[PDB]
Amino acid sequence: PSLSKEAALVHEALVARGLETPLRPPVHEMDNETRKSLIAGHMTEIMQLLNLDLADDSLMETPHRIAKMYVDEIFSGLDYANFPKITLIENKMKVDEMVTVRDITLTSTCEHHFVTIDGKATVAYIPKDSVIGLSKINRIVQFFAQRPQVQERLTQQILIALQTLLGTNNVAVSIDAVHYCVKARGIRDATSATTTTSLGGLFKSSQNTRHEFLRAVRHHN
Amino acid sequence: PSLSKEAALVHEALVARGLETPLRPPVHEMDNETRKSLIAGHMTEIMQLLNLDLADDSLMETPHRIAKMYVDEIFSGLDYANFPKITLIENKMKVDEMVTVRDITLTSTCEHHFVTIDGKATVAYIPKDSVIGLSKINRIVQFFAQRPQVQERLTQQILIALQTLLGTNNVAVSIDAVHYCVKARGIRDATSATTTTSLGGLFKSSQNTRHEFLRAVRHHN
Amino acid sequence: PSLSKEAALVHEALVARGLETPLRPPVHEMDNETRKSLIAGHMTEIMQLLNLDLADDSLMETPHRIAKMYVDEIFSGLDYANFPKITLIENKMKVDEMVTVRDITLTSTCEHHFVTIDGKATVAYIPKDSVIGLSKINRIVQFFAQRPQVQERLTQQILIALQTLLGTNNVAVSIDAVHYCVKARGIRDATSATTTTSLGGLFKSSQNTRHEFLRAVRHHN
Amino acid sequence: PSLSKEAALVHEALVARGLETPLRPPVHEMDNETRKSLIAGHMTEIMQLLNLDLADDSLMETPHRIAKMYVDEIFSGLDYANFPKITLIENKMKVDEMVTVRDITLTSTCEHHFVTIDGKATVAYIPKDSVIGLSKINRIVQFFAQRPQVQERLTQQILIALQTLLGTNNVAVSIDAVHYCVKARGIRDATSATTTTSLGGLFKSSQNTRHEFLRAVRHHN
Amino acid sequence: PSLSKEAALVHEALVARGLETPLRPPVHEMDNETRKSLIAGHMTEIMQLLNLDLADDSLMETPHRIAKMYVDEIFSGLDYANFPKITLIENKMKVDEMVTVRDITLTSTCEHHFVTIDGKATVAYIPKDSVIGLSKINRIVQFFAQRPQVQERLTQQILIALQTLLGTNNVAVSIDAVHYCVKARGIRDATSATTTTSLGGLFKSSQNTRHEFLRAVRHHN
Amino acid sequence: PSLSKEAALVHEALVARGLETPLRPPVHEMDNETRKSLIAGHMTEIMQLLNLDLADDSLMETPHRIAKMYVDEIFSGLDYANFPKITLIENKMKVDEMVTVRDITLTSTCEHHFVTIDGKATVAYIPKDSVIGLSKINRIVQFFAQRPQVQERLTQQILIALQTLLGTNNVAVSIDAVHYCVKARGIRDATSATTTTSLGGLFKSSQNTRHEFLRAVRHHN
Amino acid sequence: PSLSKEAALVHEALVARGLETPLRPPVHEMDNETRKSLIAGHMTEIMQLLNLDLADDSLMETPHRIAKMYVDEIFSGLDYANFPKITLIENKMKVDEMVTVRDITLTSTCEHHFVTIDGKATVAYIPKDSVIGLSKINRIVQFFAQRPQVQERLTQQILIALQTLLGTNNVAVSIDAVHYCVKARGIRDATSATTTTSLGGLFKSSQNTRHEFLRAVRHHN
Amino acid sequence: PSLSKEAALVHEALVARGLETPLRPPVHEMDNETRKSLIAGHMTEIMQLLNLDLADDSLMETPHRIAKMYVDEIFSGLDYANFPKITLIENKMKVDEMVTVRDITLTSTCEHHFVTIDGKATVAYIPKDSVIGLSKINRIVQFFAQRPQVQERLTQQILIALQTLLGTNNVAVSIDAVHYCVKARGIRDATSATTTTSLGGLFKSSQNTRHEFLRAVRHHN
Amino acid sequence: PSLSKEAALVHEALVARGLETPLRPPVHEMDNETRKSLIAGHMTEIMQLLNLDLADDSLMETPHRIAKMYVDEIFSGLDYANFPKITLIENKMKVDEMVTVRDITLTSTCEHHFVTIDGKATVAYIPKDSVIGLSKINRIVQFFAQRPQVQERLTQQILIALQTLLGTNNVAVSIDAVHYCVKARGIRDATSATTTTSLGGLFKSSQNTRHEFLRAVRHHN
Ligand SMILES: [Cl-]
Ligand SMILES: [Cl-]
Ligand SMILES: [Cl-]
Ligand SMILES: [Cl-]
Ligand SMILES: [Cl-]
Ligand SMILES: [Cl-]
Ligand SMILES: [Cl-]
Ligand SMILES: [Cl-]
Ligand SMILES: [Cl-]
Ligand SMILES: [Zn+2]
Ligand SMILES: [Zn+2]
Ligand SMILES: [Zn+2]
Ligand SMILES: [Zn+2]
Ligand SMILES: [Zn+2]
Ligand SMILES: [Zn+2]
Ligand SMILES: [Zn+2]
Ligand SMILES: [Zn+2]
Ligand SMILES: [Zn+2]
């Protein structure tokens, strides 16, 4: 009772290429309710250095909400215990052209200011011996997304994970997103978006394949 | 009085390629009024198991409605006695460029949860000896769509059937659809959509042809 | 350990007004895991009646997948043990103008055929003593959405629930949806949508208020 | 050297009506740099509790960026030392019809999870003796937005602030926004948005005026 | 075995108001296979009078196709044996606000030249004792649309029939359509469209109600 | 006094290639006014067979209106006496790059049911010795459009006609249309459209030219 | 053999209110081929004062084309011999709400520089004793449009004419157009449009009616 | 005092390639005012032949406005005394990639009926030694547009003019426009538009370049 | 205390290729507040020659505001003391496909009239050893945009400045803007816009790469 075959495989692959999120061993076995109260403790401190009145009916519970959100939600992707269960049917249909999943909702956080990243992901792969459940791609994407991230690392992690679970390197990933740490503060650019793409296999090597995919990416609604 | 030339041709061609829908032999001759009532009875139990009050004037008729929807409507594609009448005219116009029928309405069911799939298909072929009635393409698409499906299989069936009927390997099919078992539940993604395509003859081999078709696909209204 | 103050209040308000979903008392404490298998059992029988090979690597978990989806997901709103938690701060800001939450995502199922209803809700209220957490409105809407519904009933239920929890009659609800049993089968209308609305108090009696709300409805993205 | 007339006046006003952001007296004069280093202090603790390797070159400066962002940017409207410089020309043009500034860019933070709030503001007023510079309206709006807010309060603050600095009650404010703690977490609604409006003077009392303003609000690009 | 309660009710109500379609008594019992072949024969002559070569494999089947289209399809609305089965449930939800079904697909024929009319209908009613099945509205619209028409008459028939069936004068119908005998020939106007509406009960008398309905009409996709 | 040089050239080119509309020689000089009445006669019989009261002030001119429309309007392209006049200036500007006339309005009729075809054409050619009047392209397209057509044939005819009149094989034609016999009846698909294309000379042999043209097609307004 | 009942009626009505285009008696009976050669004569002169070389293959025929265009086309509305034939059916359907014809194509000329006016017309009337053929409104509109015009006079003429032919003053006309003499020369404004509206009867007097109509006008595609 | 280097150079170029607008030597020095009064002279004759009452206050100044418009505006590019002043900075920036000015407003007149031509131009060039001011490109384009044109010639004139004034053959020009003598008269096509492109240098010869330019052309707003 | 490493490196590189903004040696150390004041006077001077009454309570502050604006804001990119702080991280993610930043807000000024330039920039590069923080690119762009500019140069500057800080020639830049000196004065073209692009490394020599990036450019919102 710890990890799953797939979860293990992916994690190994990610460290092997040295693409895992920069983590440290958990040292000693610390409860999650402990981590959460500890984290609310610090949030109470920060909130006081801001001069907010924690006595307020609305503010009082924020430290604890921020604590559950960090551990249970927006960063749950740092604990492989949360990896999604994977299901794969055999490729009896003999699909040999690419399958594409466009405009996958994707919300993450910039590791640089812990601010929101709103974006869309398009993922395509060429089935080999197995066909993956379609929702699973959405879930694998949201998983890596729930981690403090840098867009370039995010795009690459997804490629590797899917590559690992599908059994081919013929996978491609493109992400188009908006960083609120560029929009809401700093340079305050309200109109820019960033686009990153990772291409494995034929998607990288074969010019014709490379463009059918790039030609398909970017489907604004 | 059973099946038709075309219906049987198509059916064989699918079984030959290992692409038919996972079916079992109807064992003993079961009349549809009988399948419908038996089915109706199970839905009656399922609704009771859900604590619904079948004594209500709105819910009362639901088991018979669901059973009829299953047998005559949404899954009627599993019975080749429903295959559409095909009509082919002689290619006296000597067309030798592709004919594309785009944005064909496509409603179907995900075989993993029996939930609505809503999408659109784009089909193209290059006439050899015969030109098919346009409406017939739409019809063929709906027939295979009225079956519990997996988008990747559904796509190939439309292809193989068309090739078979048209006497050419020069056919291409593309489907862009939304799966409600991805949107309405589970990961609950309100924006992703899946695109799958299958190309035959020149649409596969000729890079020229292939990209002309792909280029034309995706005509959002 | 059974029900929560909010939940019980809501369920009673609805019963008193005769707007609860038609439900028959459980009878005996039948365990949920028992219900799922009985349901999954009947689904198996239904699928064998359609002649599908349940021995297929893709159709085997289906009966089980449906059972779990029905009981745990799309019909979870039938069990008040799933009523969302309510958080209400006091109206110190002295807000006396309607707050409007629009384009709330809403996926439901029709009770006449158990087919997908995909729509959008717009809720509005004039806070009296308390202001509610914004997401709770969303959560309340989805709770009632996960039930075999009739759009007319669904709209009323959301009104009563909200009127009850906020201690006011000044609430308004409008739902704009697409029913697949109209779209995907039957008459097969691919463009019609249905709009229903429930107006309480001022939204109903005051011409001025009523139109301010209706004017602000139907925000297609 | 502390505060300016404008700010003290606005500040008093909000406090008088019980609409100031819940703040605690600083207590003792803590140097903003200490504050930041303390905040960055606690954030480091938190990042360690999430098991992130702060030894990494990318995560290394994060606690310090967050600290600086919090105090100097996203929450800078908590200190009136930051209130914008107001300019008021004489209303010689004898303007007696509303002036409406629409689609003011507004990015704030919800106070329940400190997550991004992205929206637009529409402000109108009827000039009495003074006529404020246009951009000031933009600056005042963004001032109160740089605080842990609640849309209902933020709307009121803006109204009160402008009525005060303008000399009239004839001011209207409407904000329309997306709360990411609703969109990127929890219920995860990708489509809803919230609209709040605060009406003063003729905008509240005069129906003709009230609807002239409501009619114009909501200019999506 | 002839007509149905509702079919006859509706039919009478139209004749009573002098709104039925200009029909004559079927004289002697003429079987539809007979009407179809007789019709087919005239189209055969008309096509010959046009110098078309019925020996061609594409034109050969046209007379039988046109006759069937006329009798079973596009004009099948002239025979009440085709009226749709109506289903009404008890208004236990006590709805007392209008229900609007908007953008119903409507294809019809101009009676002046037997040319396609393509448009959309918006229908609304306020339930008294009963709520009708939504799909039934669409169906009723198509029934009266499958008749040689004049938009102004077609609009009223839908109204009167609905009033009759729903036991209320509180119904409203609006149709926006394109006439191909205006677009495809004659003046040849590629952009005009005609809107016609008929209001009953409160939708006529109450200015309040009337404008709420009109306000909601015209939902271009 | 019978036919014009252009007309005769065109009619012959089409006959030689076997692409003329299937026509049977008149036989005897039957006067057009005689044809119209015989046609109007049969239409009368057809309408009486549908049970319509031809004595109605609105249905009385119909048989006569149809006859005139068929012979004089929508099928006028069957009589080369209606071929448009051609004006060709010499190519002094030495134009050697394709001229493209796009979104040419095209309304036609299907030959399988005589129902409206509403579409758009895009024509392109590389002038050799002569440049044609722009409107003539339009006029040529509508000439062939006014004939019971099959889109595949229609496209070829326009190519041949233009190739013939301009003395070049460097012409290209693409037609994008909606067939009401698909939309308004039968399968009743409300979203599919059909695209056909005919490429001559360089447009067919030169990869470079072919794509420049296809790339420039499908200009939805 | 000169004029038609309707044509006369309208012309009288127009002079009676003194709204006719400023014409003069034709003095003496001058042939139309004479007027046209005379007019080409002057056009040849103008063209020479511009230094164009009329010897050119393209220019040579312009004087005559401009001459036919003026007399036979763009100004044919100055000769009531061209008025359209009107057909009116009796209002047996008892329509008593307004009928509307939107986005009627309308091309005219400014009397001030004989340059193009591109626009759209919306016309509505409330049937009284008779219902007019729908295409007839389009034709009456294009008729007055084919005259040197000033937009305000144009709008009024149409009102009167329809008022005269329908037998009620309850008619309304709105025109939205673009004047190329404002766009292509002079101030050269590329974005403005002008809108004129004439309201007769209840459309002018009754506030409620006045706005249902104004609320409907302006349907950009 | 007659012409400038720029103009004489352009002029010679067009004449050398046989692309100048067909002009006749002025012959004798006629004073532009006489010309205008002569032109206004003939236009008065024409308006009298159309039976318009020139005694009217609105039609009174028309012949004089037309005369002035013709000579001083819409046809002013016929006199090179009107050629724009060209400015050329030194290409120090060493720009070696194309510069593309898109959607240049272009309003011209067709030379067959002197009717409005409204369109857009897209121009690109690859700087060699000189780099022209941006607006000049706009001015040169509008210079040749102010002439009775033929789109095919107008496109060529612009190309030649710019190649000459720039020092390179690397210039591309594409115009897309609506001819009103096609839209407002004759065939009356409300939707078609014509596209003409002229390619020089690498734009003609280099496929890579050619398609980079064609790819970017056609930016509808 | 003068300039930073980066700043220096960029500035040199520009001078080296001779693409620096034409600057003269400051000569003697003149304080800014002194420059601002000297400029202010010269404004008061100009505003007096325009005849504007500087005594007005609203025109008063202008020379001082224009004063601040030129030096402190819109031309601040002239002083490298303002170059933004650059932050790079290790490319441990092994990113080797391009990273694209689109629709970057760009507000410049033309150097020919000091008039507003309003565009959008798209920047891309293929990471080598370091990966720049996203927000930085935006900052670099606004820096060079804060200078009296000529589009063709601005594009070039942004390119070199980036190739220098990233250590790769593999950078690409595209700018699409509207020059108000072309729109609001002079030729007054309200619709044209200009596009300039600079390609380094593979973006210039690799056909494939070159087109991947050009295919991405131009993301209108
Ligand atoms: Cl930053
Ligand atoms: Cl799942
Ligand atoms: Cl039904
Ligand atoms: Cl929550
Ligand atoms: Cl007509
Ligand atoms: Cl069919
Ligand atoms: Cl003027
Ligand atoms: Cl013509
Ligand atoms: Cl200039
Ligand atoms: Zn960041
Ligand atoms: Zn599923
Ligand atoms: Zn249903
Ligand atoms: Zn929150
Ligand atoms: Zn008609
Ligand atoms: Zn057909
Ligand atoms: Zn004018
Ligand atoms: Zn012309
Ligand atoms: Zn400038």
Q: Please answer whether residues E157 and G94 qualify as being in contact, where contact means their C-beta atoms are separated by less than 8 angstroms.
A: no
Measure the CA–CA gap between H166 and H160, rounded to whole angstroms: 10
CB contact under 8 A, A92 and B18: yes
Interface mutation vs chain E, best among C149, C154, C156, C187, most E CBs within 10 Å: C187
Q: What residue type is B11 in one-letter code?
A: H
Q: Please answer whether residues B192 and A104 qualify as being in contact, where contact means their C-beta atoms are separated by less than 8 angstroms.
A: yes
Q: If we measure between CA atoms, which residue out of I197, B40, B215 comes closest to residue H97?
A: I197
CATH of C86-221, one of 3.90.550.10, 3.30.1130.10, 3.30.470.10, 3.40.190.10: 3.30.1130.10
Give me the residues of F, 120-179, that contact G with CB < 8 A: none
Residue H120 in tokens: 């857009």
Instruction: Give me the helices (H) in G17-90, please.
Output: 32-49, 62-68
Which residue in chain H is spatially nearest to E190 when comparing CA positions?
Answer: H190
> How many Cα atoms are found within 13 Å in the side-chain-facing hemisphere of B9?
14
Q: What residue type is C73 in one-letter code?
A: E
**CA B142 vs CA B77, B155, G144: distances in Å:** 8, 12, 51
CB contact under 8 A, C191 and F188: no
Q: Which bin fits A174, alpha (ψ -120 to 50), beta or left (φ > 0)?
A: beta
Chain H environment of E188 (Cβ under 8 Å): 188
Q: What residue type is E138 in one-letter code?
A: N
CA of H150 to the centre of ligand 8 (A): 14
D80 in contact with chain A, both atoms CB, cutoff 8 A: no
Rounded to 5 degrees, φ, ψ at D121 are -120, 150
Q: Which class in CATH covers the domain with range H1-85?
A: mainly alpha
Measure the CA–CA gap between E61 and E50, rounded to whole angstroms: 16
Q: Is B219 annotated as a binding residue?
A: no
Q: If we measure between CA atoms, which residue out of I85, I87, I92 comes closest to residue I128?
A: I92
Q: Is G219 annotated as a binding residue?
A: no
Min Cα separation E185/chain H (Å): 12
Measure the CA–CA gap between H31 and F87, rounded to whole angstroms: 37
I12, I48, I73, I112: the catalytic one is I112
Measure the CA–CA gap between G167 and G171, rounded to whole angstroms: 10
Residues 6+ apart with CB under 8 A from F160: F10, F13, F14, F17, F19
Measure the CA–CA gap between G64 and G69, rounded to whole angstroms: 8
Instruction: Indicate the DSSP class of residue C52.
Output: B
CA of F148 to the centre of ligand 15 (A): 10
Residue H27 in tokens: 């012959």
Measure the CA–CA gap between A146 and B138, rounded to whole angstroms: 42
Handedness of CA A46, A51, A55, A57 (dihedral sign): negative
Min Cα separation D206/chain I (Å): 32
Rounded to 5 degrees, φ, ψ at F191 are -130, -10
Q: H or E stretch including I103?
A: strand I99-110
Which residue in chain C is spatially nearest to A58 when comparing CA positions?
Answer: C89
CB-based burial label for E127 (10 Å; 0-12, 13-18, 19+): buried
Measure the CA–CA gap between A98 and A88, rounded to whole angstroms: 16
Measure the CA–CA gap between A111 and I89, rounded to whole angstroms: 12
Q: Please answer whether residues B134 and B162 qualify as being in contact, where contact means their C-beta atoms are separated by less than 8 angstroms.
A: no
Q: Of all residues in chain I, what percent are helix, strand and coil, respectively (each to 5)?
A: 45, 20, 35
Chain E environment of C14 (Cβ under 8 Å): none
CB-based burial label for F129 (10 Å; 0-12, 13-18, 19+): exposed
Measure the CA–CA gap between I39 and I59, rounded to whole angstroms: 16
**Which SS3 state, helix, strand or coil, does residue G109 take?**
strand
CB-based burial label for F42 (10 Å; 0-12, 13-18, 19+): buried
Q: If we measure between CA atoms, which residue out of A14, C54, G51, E209 comes closest to residue H148?
A: G51
Chain position carrying tokens 């798209």: I122
Note the maximum CA span of chain H: 64
Strand partners, G85: none
Residue E99 in tokens: 């229900």
Q: Please answer whether residues G108 and G181 qualify as being in contact, where contact means their C-beta atoms are separated by less than 8 angstroms.
A: no
Measure the CA–CA gap between B198 and I210, rounded to whole angstroms: 30
Rounded to 5 degrees, φ, ψ at A102 are -100, 155
Measure the CA–CA gap between H38 and F217, rounded to whole angstroms: 47
CB atoms within 10 A of CB A83: 20
Q: Please answer whether residues B64 and B40 qualify as being in contact, where contact means their C-beta atoms are separated by less than 8 angstroms.
A: yes
Strand partners, D132: D88
CB atoms within 10 A of CB G200: 19
Q: What residue type is F43 in one-letter code?
A: M
C-alpha angle A60-A61-A65 in degrees, rounded to nearest 5: 150
Which residue in chain C is spatially nearest to A133 when comparing CA positions?
Answer: C58
The residues of C that are catalytic are: 110-113, 151, 179, 181
Measure the CA–CA gap between D16 and C93, rounded to whole angstroms: 12
Strand partners, E89: E131
CB contact under 8 A, H188 and E191: no
Measure the CA–CA gap between D33 and D71, rounded to whole angstroms: 9
Handedness of CA G44, G48, G50, G55 (dihedral sign): positive
Q: Rg of the Cα trace of chain G?
A: 20
Measure the CA–CA gap between B56 and E89, rounded to whole angstroms: 10
Contact of chains F and H by CB distance (3 or more pairs under 8 angstroms)? yes
Q: Which bin fits G188, alpha (ψ -120 to 50), beta or left (φ > 0)?
A: left
From first CA to last CA, the distance across chain A in angstroms is 42
Q: If we measure between CA atoms, which residue out of H119, H114, H108, H95 comes closest to residue H177?
A: H119
Resolution in A: 2.8
Chain A environment of D24 (Cβ under 8 Å): 48, 51-54
Contact of chains G and A by CB distance (3 or more pairs under 8 angstroms)? no
Q: Please answer whether residues A50 and D75 qualify as being in contact, where contact means their C-beta atoms are separated by less than 8 angstroms.
A: yes
**Which SS3 state, helix, strand or coil, does residue F173 take?**
strand
Q: Please answer whether residues E88 and C159 qualify as being in contact, where contact means their C-beta atoms are separated by less than 8 angstroms.
A: no
Residue A65 in tokens: 């909400």
G12 is catalytic: no
* Domain positions in chain H: 1-85, 86-221
E11 is catalytic: no
Q: Please answer whether residues D80 and D14 qualify as being in contact, where contact means their C-beta atoms are separated by less than 8 angstroms.
A: no
Detail the DSSP E strand segments found in G75-202: 88-90, 99-110, 116-125, 130-132, 148-149, 171-179, 194-199
Rounded to 5 degrees, φ, ψ at C37 are -70, -40
DSSP string, D141-172: HHHHHSSEE-HHHHHHHHHHHHHHHHT-S-EE
Polymer length of chain D: 221
Instruction: Indicate the DSSP class of residue E23.
Output: B
Chain D environment of A181 (Cβ under 8 Å): 69
I112 is catalytic: yes
Q: Which residues surround ligand 13, an ion (CB under 5 A)?
A: D 110, 112-113, 181
Strand partners, D171: D125
Strand partners, D99: D125
Chain A environment of D106 (Cβ under 8 Å): none
Q: What residue type is F134 in one-letter code?
A: L
Q: If we measure between CA atoms, which residue out of G189, F103, F128, I184 comes closest to residue H176?
A: F103
Chain position carrying tokens 């039934």: E136
Instruction: Indicate the DSSP class of residue E82.
Output: G
CB pairs under 8 A between E and H: 4
Measure the CA–CA gap between C131 and C139, rounded to whole angstroms: 15
CA of F173 to the centre of ligand 6 (A): 27
Rounded to 5 degrees, φ, ψ at C220 are -60, 95
CB contact under 8 A, H188 and E188: yes
Q: Please answer whether residues D77 and D153 qualify as being in contact, where contact means their C-beta atoms are separated by less than 8 angstroms.
A: no
Residues 6+ apart with CB under 8 A from D92: none
Measure the CA–CA gap between H121 and H104, rounded to whole angstroms: 5
Rounded to 5 degrees, φ, ψ at E121 are -115, 150
Residue I146 in tokens: 């804060």
**CA E185 vs CA E189, F71, G177: distances in Å:** 8, 12, 24
Q: Rg of the Cα trace of chain B?
A: 20
Rounded to 5 degrees, φ, ψ at B192 are -70, 160
Nearest to D195 among C93, C102, C127 (CB): C102
Measure the CA–CA gap between F89 and A123, rounded to whole angstroms: 54
Measure the CA–CA gap between B20 and B10, rounded to whole angstroms: 10
Q: Please answer whether residues B21 and B147 qualify as being in contact, where contact means their C-beta atoms are separated by less than 8 angstroms.
A: yes
Rounded to 5 degrees, φ, ψ at H106 are -135, 115
* Dihedral (Cα; C197, C200, C205, C207), 10-degree rounding: -50
Detail the DSSP E strand segments found in chain C: 88-90, 99-110, 116-125, 130-132, 148-149, 171-179, 193-199
Q: If we measure between CA atoms, which residue out of F30, F38, F48, F186 comes closest to residue F110?
A: F186
DSSP string, F63-127: HHHHHHIIIIIITGGGSGGGPPP--EEE-TT---S-EEEEEEEEEEEETTT--EEEEEEEEEE--
* Dihedral (Cα; D88, D92, D94, D98), 10-degree rounding: -20
Chain A environment of B192 (Cβ under 8 Å): 101-105, 138
Instruction: Indicate the DSSP class of residue H92.
Output: -
Q: Please answer whether residues C88 and C134 qualify as being in contact, where contact means their C-beta atoms are separated by less than 8 angstroms.
A: no
**Which SS3 state, helix, strand or coil, does residue D36 take?**
helix
Instruction: Give me the helices (H) in chain B, please.
Output: 5-17, 32-48, 62-68, 134-145, 151-166, 180-183, 201-205, 207-216
**Which SS3 state, helix, strand or coil, does residue E22 take?**
coil
Q: Please answer whether residues D3 and D12 qualify as being in contact, where contact means their C-beta atoms are separated by less than 8 angstroms.
A: no
Measure the CA–CA gap between A101 and A87, rounded to whole angstroms: 17
Interface mutation vs chain A, best among B19, B115, B152, most A CBs within 10 Å: B152
